[PDB]
Amino acid sequence: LKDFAGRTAFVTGGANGVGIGLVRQLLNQGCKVAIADIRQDSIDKALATLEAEGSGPEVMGVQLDVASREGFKMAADEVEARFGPVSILCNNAGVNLFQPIEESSYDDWDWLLGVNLHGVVNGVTTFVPRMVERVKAGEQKGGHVVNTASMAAFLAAGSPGIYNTTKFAVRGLSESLHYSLLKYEIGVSVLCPGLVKAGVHEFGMEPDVIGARVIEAMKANRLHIFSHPDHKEELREVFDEIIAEYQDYPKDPGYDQRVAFEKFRADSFAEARRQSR
Amino acid sequence: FAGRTAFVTGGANGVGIGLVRQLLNQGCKVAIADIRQDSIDKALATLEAESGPEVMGVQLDVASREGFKMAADEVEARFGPVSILCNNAGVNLFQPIEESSYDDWDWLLGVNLHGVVNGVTTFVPRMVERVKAGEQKGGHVVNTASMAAFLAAGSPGIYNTTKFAVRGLSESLHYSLLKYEIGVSVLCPGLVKHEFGMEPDVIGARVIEAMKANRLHIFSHPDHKEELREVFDEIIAEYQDYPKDPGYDQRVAFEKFRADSFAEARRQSR
């Protein structure tokens, strides 16, 4: 992704937290940015303070429930009418609920799936096919999709069960999209933060620091953005344990033929990853 | 195992019928649930051709929450409380995400994700209440994901998305159910029997052993171990040796703490 100047970006959950940091840093790269958020009140305050920062003519707000496919289309059309084609999409909207799954209701699944999973599906489905059409037409060159997952996309304990489910799903979506969009040179990253700012609420990473790390990772088309170096050792141990779960099973009939074919699609996939790096 | 009742979705063939047969061969009573009536009937015919007083069939669209509830009720009215749940229904679609419509998402999410959500929401609270009442001891939920829960290429994008989600769901439920001694496994097979795919009976047999160990990931296939080791190495290699940001020292002290607790839960699990 060369040069951000003159590009239009759309950021869901853009009104605060990780979102406002992304918006600010994109602005700092010369992007026009639309803040999309569920609450009009949060949007107005974000716009107020970005105007106070001097970015006024480069930002707009659009009230949006990311769970709504209809709403997402209408919001995209509005932003593209005002600021022109969007080539950067940050699906950053998210909600949480600290509960194990066996204590969670169908209403709880619907609420979290709508915002955390559908929001990303809807963002991707609204914008990516537009991007792909513009690229095939020579009307767009390059672009990026950043989806905010979590370290919960790797490290899943008992709670928050539904959250961990939606974050693993966002990771699988993002990894798949990353490989399918290489041919169009649209980048895809999944942002996997730890704690964002007992004093717990106090020592989380600053959204602006996360934002800077994201911009650099987008420039690299880095698949996994580990904004936090915190979990490296733990994740390595978790990985070692999964590998340790392989059992020393006997060859079933058809094994040699199957592995021969398998090493074949394995080669094509390692080829796709090698081109990604 | 003997005397337990199991409920298997997509139970009419592939992996599902492998699990059904092997579960039947441990002395379980087994309900085959599947969306297609005649599939069920074919499976029931094959199995009678081998006891049939211990197997039943129930038509079910796993995407339907009301349907799942009624199927659960029917099974438990005839065979008794279900203590083994295999959420094994699944569909695939070989397409990248940017070429997939909302209808494609709704279909695959319906079967592959909502199926597991519905199975778990229908049955697990019943199991937990019974464990709490001292009416049930032990139990198991096996969810069929795929090696696509680990190895996600451009296609099939929606399929990979649903399988990551089932894996994340299974891992979370495994840890939360430990205190009720209800086991949870995610079955991650490679190719199933098209002439060199693994026999479903062999997958089922390996699943039964893993259930007894409460093994979190069931890698039925030795095939992918080296490939997966490589993927994990590349993921760790994406970590960036970033500078210490403000609060880093406190934050990392806290993370070592919750990691310690989590590492403890995993050691207990093993």
Side-chain angles (χ1 to χ4, degrees), chain A residues 1 3-262 264-277, chain B residues 1-255 257-270:
Chain A
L1 218 192
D3 110 281
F4 285 53
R7 284 175 180 293
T8 292
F10 188 101
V11 178
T12 68
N16 39 224
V18 165
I20 197 61
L22 296 169
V23 179
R24 190 172 288 114
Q25 298 304 306
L26 261 13
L27 284 179
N28 184 83
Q29 301 293 294
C31 300
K32 282 181 186 89
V33 193
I35 297 173
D37 207 281
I38 184 71
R39 303 197 62 254
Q40 191 56 66
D41 264 276
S42 297
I43 296 162
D44 292 355
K45 204 193 82 172
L47 292 174
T49 59
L50 292 170
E51 258 272 340
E53 279 183 32
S55 286
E58 281 77 36
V59 280
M60 66 183 288
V62 60
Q63 191 281 333
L64 167 67
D65 168 22
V66 292
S68 169
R69 294 162 173 183
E70 191 163 72
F72 224 122
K73 214 232 169 229
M74 292 171 58
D77 292 357
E78 190 188 325
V79 172
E80 292 199 322
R82 203 152 109 59
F83 280 173
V86 170
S87 62
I88 300 168
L89 174 62
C90 294
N91 289 311
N92 170 253
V95 290
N96 210 337
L97 190 51
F98 197 89
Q99 282 168 201
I101 288 158
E102 75 278 0
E103 283 167 23
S104 301
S105 73
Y106 280 133
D107 285 352
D108 296 334
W109 277 106
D110 291 348
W111 178 41
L112 263 65
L113 288 168
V115 175
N116 296 358
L117 177 52
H118 289 302
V120 171
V121 169
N122 287 354
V124 166
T125 305
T126 300
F127 272 117
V128 164
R130 301 180 190 210
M131 291 192 190
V132 172
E133 290 170 59
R134 297 165 187 156
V135 168
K136 288 172 151 163
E139 293 160 20
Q140 178 182 336
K141 204 87 281 128
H144 210 85
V145 175
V146 186
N147 296 323
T148 303
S150 167
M151 290 301 306
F154 290 95
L155 297 174
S159 307
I162 300 170
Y163 183 83
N164 292 341
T165 304
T166 68
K167 295 307 170 153
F168 262 72
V170 171
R171 179 186 152 201
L173 190 162
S174 299
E175 293 181 3
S176 302
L177 192 67
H178 180 95
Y179 299 115
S180 70
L181 296 185
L182 286 175
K183 68 177 62 67
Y184 308 119
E185 313 176 305
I186 302 157
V188 180
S189 295
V190 56
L191 172 55
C192 298
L195 262 196
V196 183
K197 176 178 245 100
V200 173
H201 58 289
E202 311 264 66
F203 49 67
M205 187 171 289
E206 283 279 359
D208 286 323
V209 173
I210 303 178
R213 293 175 187 193
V214 172
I215 280 132
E216 185 280 323
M218 297 172 71
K219 292 195 222 289
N221 197 25
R222 199 170 294 130
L223 178 47
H224 303 102
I225 312 183
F226 295 116
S227 60
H228 291 58
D230 316 13
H231 311 92
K232 188 181 180 173
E233 248 49 54
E234 183 179 7
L235 187 61
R236 177 67 267 180
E237 188 49 43
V238 163
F239 286 166
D240 283 348
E241 292 174 18
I242 296 174
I243 299 297
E245 291 177 289
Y246 272 79
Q247 297 303 297
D248 289 319
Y249 294 131
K251 292 167 51 161
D252 48 312
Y255 179 94
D256 292 309
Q257 266 215 349
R258 187 179 64 244
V259 184
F261 183 93
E262 275 296 334
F264 192 85
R265 61 108 220 125
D267 279 350
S268 168
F269 180 45
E271 222 304 306
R273 302 201 306 283
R274 223 194 37 84
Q275 293 188 128
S276 169
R277 286 188 298 274
Chain B
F1 267 92
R4 293 184 179 275
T5 301
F7 187 102
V8 185
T9 69
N13 32 42
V15 173
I17 203 55
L19 299 162
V20 172
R21 174 155 38 241
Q22 295 312 302
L23 256 0
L24 289 165
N25 286 349
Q26 311 315 293
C28 300
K29 286 136 80 149
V30 183
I32 300 163
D34 228 314
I35 194 159
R36 269 198 160 184
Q37 192 50 54
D38 79 307
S39 294
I40 294 171
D41 294 325
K42 246 168 282 174
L44 292 168
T46 323
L47 300 172
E48 193 61 37
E50 300 162 25
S51 174
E54 64 170 323
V55 74
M56 72 190 276
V58 68
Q59 201 277 332
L60 172 62
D61 172 343
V62 294
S64 165
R65 299 176 173 163
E66 170 183 35
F68 226 119
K69 176 170 188 322
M70 277 190 33
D73 284 353
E74 198 179 304
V75 170
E76 293 190 323
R78 181 172 177 204
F79 283 169
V82 166
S83 63
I84 293 168
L85 173 58
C86 300
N87 290 305
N88 174 253
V91 295
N92 210 335
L93 189 51
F94 195 94
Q95 291 176 187
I97 289 163
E98 76 282 354
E99 298 172 17
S100 303
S101 65
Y102 285 127
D103 288 343
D104 297 331
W105 279 105
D106 293 344
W107 181 40
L108 256 71
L109 286 173
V111 180
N112 296 1
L113 178 50
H114 292 293
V116 171
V117 170
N118 293 348
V120 165
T121 303
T122 301
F123 278 108
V124 178
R126 302 182 185 205
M127 300 197 187
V128 161
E129 291 228 324
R130 294 167 188 150
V131 167
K132 287 176 161 168
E135 295 176 21
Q136 179 180 340
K137 229 96 235 99
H140 212 95
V141 174
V142 180
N143 297 321
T144 310
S146 184
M147 286 308 300
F150 287 99
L151 302 176
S155 290
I158 298 178
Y159 183 83
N160 293 341
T161 299
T162 70
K163 296 304 174 162
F164 270 70
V166 171
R167 159 145 88 99
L169 191 171
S170 306
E171 289 185 12
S172 297
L173 190 70
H174 180 94
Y175 295 111
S176 69
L177 295 183
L178 286 164
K179 92 203 2 86
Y180 304 116
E181 306 200 324
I182 295 169
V184 180
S185 303
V186 51
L187 172 52
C188 299
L191 278 172
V192 184
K193 181 132 293 174
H194 62 53
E195 64 170 17
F196 45 93
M198 170 173 298
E199 289 287 12
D201 285 327
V202 169
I203 290 150
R206 294 174 179 182
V207 169
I208 284 150
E209 193 285 320
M211 288 171 64
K212 284 172 195 229
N214 196 15
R215 199 173 289 138
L216 209 200
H217 305 95
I218 304 175
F219 299 113
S220 51
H221 289 56
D223 306 25
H224 311 83
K225 184 181 180 178
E226 294 317 315
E227 189 180 6
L228 190 63
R229 173 196 330 275
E230 177 62 27
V231 170
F232 287 163
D233 287 348
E234 298 173 16
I235 296 168
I236 296 297
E238 288 178 279
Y239 267 84
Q240 300 299 312
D241 188 40
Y242 287 127
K244 296 181 185 201
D245 57 312
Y248 177 96
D249 278 349
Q250 295 180 270
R251 186 180 76 237
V252 174
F254 191 79
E255 294 288 345
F257 189 79
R258 67 124 211 100
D260 281 341
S261 168
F262 191 30
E264 163 61 13
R266 301 203 308 278
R267 209 184 51 93
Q268 313 296 84
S269 183
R270 288 190 312 271

Short mmCIF file of all heavy atoms in Angstrom, two decimals, chain A residues 37-61:
data_model
loop_
_atom_site.label_atom_id
_atom_site.label_comp_id
_atom_site.label_asym_id
_atom_site.label_seq_id
_atom_site.Cartn_x
_atom_site.Cartn_y
_atom_site.Cartn_z
N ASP A 37 -20.43 4.64 13.59
CA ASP A 37 -20.66 4.19 14.95
C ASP A 37 -22.15 4.12 15.23
O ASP A 37 -22.96 4.78 14.55
CB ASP A 37 -19.94 5.11 15.94
CG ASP A 37 -19.58 4.41 17.22
OD1 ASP A 37 -20.48 4.25 18.10
OD2 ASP A 37 -18.41 4.01 17.35
N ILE A 38 -22.49 3.31 16.23
CA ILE A 38 -23.87 3.04 16.61
C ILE A 38 -24.54 4.26 17.30
O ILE A 38 -25.73 4.48 17.11
CB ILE A 38 -23.95 1.75 17.48
CG1 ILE A 38 -25.39 1.36 17.83
CG2 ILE A 38 -23.17 1.90 18.76
CD1 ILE A 38 -26.21 0.83 16.69
N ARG A 39 -23.78 5.03 18.06
CA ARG A 39 -24.34 6.15 18.81
C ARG A 39 -23.99 7.49 18.17
O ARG A 39 -22.81 7.80 17.98
CB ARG A 39 -23.84 6.14 20.26
CG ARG A 39 -24.13 4.87 21.04
CD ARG A 39 -23.96 5.13 22.54
NE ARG A 39 -24.92 6.14 23.02
CZ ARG A 39 -24.62 7.41 23.34
NH1 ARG A 39 -23.37 7.86 23.27
NH2 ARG A 39 -25.58 8.23 23.75
N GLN A 40 -25.02 8.29 17.84
CA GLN A 40 -24.80 9.64 17.28
C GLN A 40 -24.00 10.54 18.23
O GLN A 40 -23.11 11.29 17.80
CB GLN A 40 -26.11 10.31 16.88
CG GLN A 40 -25.93 11.60 16.04
CD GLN A 40 -25.11 11.36 14.77
OE1 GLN A 40 -25.54 10.66 13.86
NE2 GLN A 40 -23.93 11.95 14.72
N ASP A 41 -24.31 10.42 19.53
CA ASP A 41 -23.65 11.17 20.60
C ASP A 41 -22.13 10.95 20.67
O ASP A 41 -21.36 11.93 20.76
CB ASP A 41 -24.32 10.83 21.93
CG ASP A 41 -25.37 11.85 22.33
OD1 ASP A 41 -24.98 12.89 22.90
OD2 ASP A 41 -26.59 11.63 22.07
N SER A 42 -21.68 9.69 20.62
CA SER A 42 -20.25 9.39 20.52
C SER A 42 -19.61 9.96 19.24
O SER A 42 -18.50 10.48 19.31
CB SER A 42 -19.98 7.89 20.61
OG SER A 42 -20.36 7.38 21.87
N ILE A 43 -20.30 9.87 18.10
CA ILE A 43 -19.77 10.44 16.84
C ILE A 43 -19.56 11.96 16.92
O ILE A 43 -18.50 12.47 16.54
CB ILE A 43 -20.65 10.13 15.61
CG1 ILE A 43 -20.68 8.63 15.33
CG2 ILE A 43 -20.12 10.85 14.37
CD1 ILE A 43 -21.83 8.23 14.44
N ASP A 44 -20.57 12.68 17.42
CA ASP A 44 -20.50 14.14 17.55
C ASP A 44 -19.34 14.61 18.42
O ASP A 44 -18.67 15.59 18.09
CB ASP A 44 -21.83 14.71 18.04
CG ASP A 44 -22.94 14.56 17.01
OD1 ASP A 44 -22.66 14.10 15.88
OD2 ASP A 44 -24.11 14.91 17.33
N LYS A 45 -19.07 13.90 19.51
CA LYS A 45 -17.95 14.22 20.39
C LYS A 45 -16.59 13.88 19.75
O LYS A 45 -15.60 14.57 20.01
CB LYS A 45 -18.09 13.50 21.73
CG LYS A 45 -17.34 14.19 22.87
CD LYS A 45 -17.23 13.29 24.11
CE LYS A 45 -16.06 12.30 23.99
NZ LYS A 45 -15.82 11.57 25.26
N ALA A 46 -16.55 12.84 18.93
CA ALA A 46 -15.32 12.47 18.24
C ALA A 46 -15.03 13.53 17.19
O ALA A 46 -13.90 14.02 17.09
CB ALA A 46 -15.42 11.09 17.61
N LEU A 47 -16.06 13.91 16.44
CA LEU A 47 -15.94 14.97 15.45
C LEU A 47 -15.53 16.30 16.09
O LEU A 47 -14.67 17.01 15.56
CB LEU A 47 -17.23 15.11 14.63
CG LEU A 47 -17.62 13.97 13.68
CD1 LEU A 47 -18.99 14.25 13.10
CD2 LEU A 47 -16.60 13.73 12.55
N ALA A 48 -16.13 16.62 17.24
CA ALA A 48 -15.82 17.86 17.96
C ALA A 48 -14.33 17.98 18.25
O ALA A 48 -13.73 19.04 18.00
CB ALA A 48 -16.61 17.95 19.27
N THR A 49 -13.73 16.90 18.75
CA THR A 49 -12.35 16.95 19.21
C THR A 49 -11.33 16.77 18.09
O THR A 49 -10.21 17.28 18.17
CB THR A 49 -12.08 16.01 20.40
OG1 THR A 49 -12.37 14.66 20.03
CG2 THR A 49 -12.94 16.41 21.61
N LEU A 50 -11.71 16.07 17.02
CA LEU A 50 -10.90 16.04 15.80
C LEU A 50 -10.90 17.40 15.07
O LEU A 50 -9.87 17.78 14.48
CB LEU A 50 -11.30 14.89 14.87
CG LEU A 50 -11.01 13.47 15.37
CD1 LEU A 50 -11.68 12.44 14.48
CD2 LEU A 50 -9.51 13.19 15.50
N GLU A 51 -12.03 18.11 15.10
CA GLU A 51 -12.11 19.49 14.60
C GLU A 51 -11.21 20.44 15.40
O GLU A 51 -10.51 21.27 14.83
CB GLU A 51 -13.55 19.99 14.63
CG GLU A 51 -14.24 19.96 13.28
CD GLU A 51 -14.01 21.24 12.47
OE1 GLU A 51 -13.66 22.27 13.08
OE2 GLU A 51 -14.19 21.21 11.23
N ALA A 52 -11.23 20.27 16.72
CA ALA A 52 -10.31 20.96 17.62
C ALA A 52 -8.85 20.62 17.34
O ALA A 52 -7.96 21.43 17.60
CB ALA A 52 -10.66 20.65 19.06
N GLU A 53 -8.60 19.42 16.81
CA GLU A 53 -7.24 19.00 16.41
C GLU A 53 -6.82 19.59 15.06
O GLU A 53 -5.63 19.59 14.73
CB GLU A 53 -7.10 17.47 16.40
CG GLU A 53 -6.86 16.85 17.78
CD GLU A 53 -6.65 15.33 17.74
OE1 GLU A 53 -6.10 14.81 16.75
OE2 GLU A 53 -7.03 14.65 18.73
N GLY A 54 -7.79 20.08 14.29
CA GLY A 54 -7.54 20.72 13.01
C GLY A 54 -7.88 19.90 11.77
O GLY A 54 -7.58 20.31 10.66
N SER A 55 -8.51 18.74 11.96
CA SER A 55 -8.73 17.80 10.85
C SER A 55 -10.11 17.94 10.19
O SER A 55 -10.42 17.24 9.22
CB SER A 55 -8.49 16.36 11.31
OG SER A 55 -7.11 16.09 11.47
N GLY A 56 -10.90 18.89 10.71
CA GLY A 56 -12.27 19.18 10.28
C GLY A 56 -12.76 18.82 8.89
O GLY A 56 -13.69 18.02 8.77
N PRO A 57 -12.18 19.43 7.84
CA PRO A 57 -12.59 19.15 6.45
C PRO A 57 -12.31 17.72 5.96
O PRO A 57 -12.76 17.35 4.87
CB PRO A 57 -11.78 20.16 5.63
CG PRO A 57 -11.43 21.24 6.58
CD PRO A 57 -11.23 20.55 7.90
N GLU A 58 -11.57 16.92 6.73
CA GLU A 58 -11.16 15.58 6.28
C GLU A 58 -11.96 14.44 6.94
O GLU A 58 -11.79 13.28 6.57
CB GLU A 58 -9.66 15.35 6.48
CG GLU A 58 -8.76 16.01 5.41
CD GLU A 58 -8.60 17.51 5.61
OE1 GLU A 58 -8.55 17.97 6.78
OE2 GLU A 58 -8.52 18.24 4.60
N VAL A 59 -12.80 14.78 7.91
CA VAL A 59 -13.61 13.79 8.63
C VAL A 59 -15.12 14.04 8.53
O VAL A 59 -15.58 15.18 8.49
CB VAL A 59 -13.25 13.68 10.14
CG1 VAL A 59 -12.03 12.83 10.32
CG2 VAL A 59 -13.09 15.05 10.79
N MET A 60 -15.86 12.94 8.51
CA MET A 60 -17.32 12.97 8.60
C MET A 60 -17.77 11.81 9.50
O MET A 60 -16.98 10.91 9.83
CB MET A 60 -17.97 12.89 7.21
CG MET A 60 -17.74 11.58 6.51
SD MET A 60 -18.41 11.45 4.84
CE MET A 60 -20.15 11.34 5.22
N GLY A 61 -19.05 11.85 9.88
CA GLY A 61 -19.64 10.85 10.76
C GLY A 61 -20.86 10.25 10.10
O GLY A 61 -21.55 10.91 9.32
#
